[PDB]
Amino acid sequence: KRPNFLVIVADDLGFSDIGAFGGEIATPNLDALAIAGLRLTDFHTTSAASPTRSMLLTGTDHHIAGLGTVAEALTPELEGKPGYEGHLNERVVALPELLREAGYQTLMAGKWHLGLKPEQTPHARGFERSFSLLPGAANHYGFEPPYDESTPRILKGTPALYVEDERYLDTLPEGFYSSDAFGDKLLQYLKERDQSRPFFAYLPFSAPHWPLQAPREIVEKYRGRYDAGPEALRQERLARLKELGLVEADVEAHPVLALTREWEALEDEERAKSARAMEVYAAMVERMDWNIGRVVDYLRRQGELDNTFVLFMSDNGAEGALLEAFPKFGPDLLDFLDRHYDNSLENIGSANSYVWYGPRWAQAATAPSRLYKAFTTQGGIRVPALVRYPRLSRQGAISHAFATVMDVTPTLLDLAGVRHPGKRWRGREIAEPRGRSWLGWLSGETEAAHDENTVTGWGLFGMRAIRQGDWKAVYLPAPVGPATWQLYDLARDPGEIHDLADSQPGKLAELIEHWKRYVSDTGVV
Numbered sequence: 001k002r003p004n005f006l007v008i009v010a011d012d013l014g015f016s017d018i019g020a021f022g023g024e025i026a027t028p029n030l031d032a033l034a035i036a037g038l039r040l041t042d043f044h045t046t047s048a049a050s051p052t053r054s055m056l057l058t059g060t061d062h063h064i065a066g067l068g069t070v071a072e073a074l075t076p077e078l079e080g081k082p083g084y085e086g087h088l089n090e091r092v093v094a095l096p097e098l099l100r101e102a103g104y105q106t107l108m109a110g111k112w113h114l115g116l117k118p119e120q121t122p123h124a125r126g127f128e129r130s131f132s133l134l135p136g137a138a139n140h141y142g143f144e145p146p147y148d149e150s151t152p153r154i155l156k157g158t159p160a161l162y163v164e165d166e167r168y169l170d171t172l173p174e175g176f177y178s179s180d181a182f183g184d185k186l187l188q189y190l191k192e193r194d195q196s197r198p199f200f201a202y203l204p205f206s207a208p209h210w211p212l213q214a215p216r217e218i219v220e221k222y223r224g225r226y227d228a229g230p231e232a233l234r235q236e237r238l239a240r241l242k243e244l245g246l247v248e249a250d251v252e253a254h255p256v257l258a259l260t261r262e263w264e265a266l267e268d269e270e271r272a273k274s275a276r277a278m279e280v281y282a283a284m285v286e287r288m289d290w291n292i293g294r295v296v297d298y299l300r301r302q303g304e305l306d307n308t309f310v311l312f313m314s315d316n317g318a319e320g321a322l323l324e325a326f327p328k329f330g331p332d333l334l335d336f337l338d339r340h341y342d343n344s345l346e347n348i349g350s351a352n353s354y355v356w357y358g359p360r361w362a363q364a365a366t367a368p369s370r371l372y373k374a375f376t377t378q379g380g381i382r383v384p385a386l387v388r389y390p391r392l393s394r395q396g397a398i399s400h401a402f403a404t405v406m407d408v409t410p411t412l413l414d415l416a417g418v419r420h421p422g423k424r425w426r427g428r429e430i431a432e433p434r435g436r437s438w439l440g441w442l443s444g445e446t447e448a449a450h451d452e453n454t455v456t457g458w459g460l461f462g463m464r465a466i467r468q469g470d471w472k473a474v475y476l477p478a479p480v481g482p483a484t485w486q487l488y489d490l491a492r493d494p495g496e497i498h499d500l501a502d503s504q505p506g507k508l509a510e511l512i513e514h515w516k517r518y519v520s521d522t523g524v525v
């Protein structure tokens, strides 16, 4: 009997935020799935939202699938390059397109980020029912600033732009909050389904992405929890990750890098507003979890949960960006926020606040990894992941087997009994997956879907990484790194701390060869 699929994606969720991944945040629904299922510690996305999402729905690399760089950063020197179209292109077929022709009902509620135009929406790319925020982010409550020439570029590119199927929405309902609206819509779609056939349900939240906003009654639950700051938090998370066996007891955490003032150097007002941002974030995660519970509990009561392959992942590392630090997100973002929002302590988290938590809170969640979102180090690309499907033998454990987002499409086609069509689909040439199906591994037949010779590449925002087995080389340009290849043995040094470039030039050499083939195979510019 063919399984259902429930693929749930958090937006900028960090590695140890969820209870079953070492966190203090209340996530009882996700915990129950994770502990019963398989937690992954070596599962990888890309370093940003739309690249990852392009891969998750294709089984190939973002440079092929249309998100060679993020759309919001395309220049005229890249526009025209194949795979840099700025949206999911027609050089790929998506997973829902393939399941839909094989009898699955394809259902989505959440953030898309794969295209703004009609012919690029979920309805156009294989979803029969969809309720979607098309851009990368937006106000969770739908409160919009004035849009004119003087509006910061980062706000202009994040309107609350929603579609349902083919209808671009004029207005949002009363009481709209993103995670609740997504929960509501996917539950509706599930209740209205044809019960004699399986479904592919896609639940990409916009939480916990900035602006950090959540229901006050949930924020209140975290009052005072983060008063000790982000370095005290990082220590609690590291200890708990070791206690749970998610990281080995000897692991050396990468040092925290930040241009901001450390907690103890902050004035009391500043501290209070930063802790409140973290209390808000925690509420965002809890309320996402609560909506997940609504979906999952419905399926359970229907007797469908055990027949549903449930995959949860974040889409990249925790978000450490200072949005004020990027002039191109302006002109003056902070002044505009100061004149149009209220970020006073007591308003933070509500519709007319606009905050992000910054590098220090972000690195508490990525530890022991190096850095955070938009870096090709482990901090930006190693994300929490779980699989709950009791029809698979490998459940109840923590697995450190290498995996990536590109493995999802081939795994789900496999379970559906559906063959990838090859190099041609709907009269056009298409790419075949670069990932590998997880079926043998999760069946207990092999110990991993990949091996010591597997080669995987990353490149975005000028950064690079190239990995074979557990050897990884990384390239961070100025001002963020030495603008040279650094080499790491991930099996001994997960924090990417000890550069082996000089002591293992032969291994670096080979990885640089692999990197050239990566660029060549996928069209990296």
Ligand SMILES: [Ca+2]
Residues within 6 Å of the ligand: 010, 011, 012, 048, 049, 315, 316
């Ligand atoms: Ca993201």
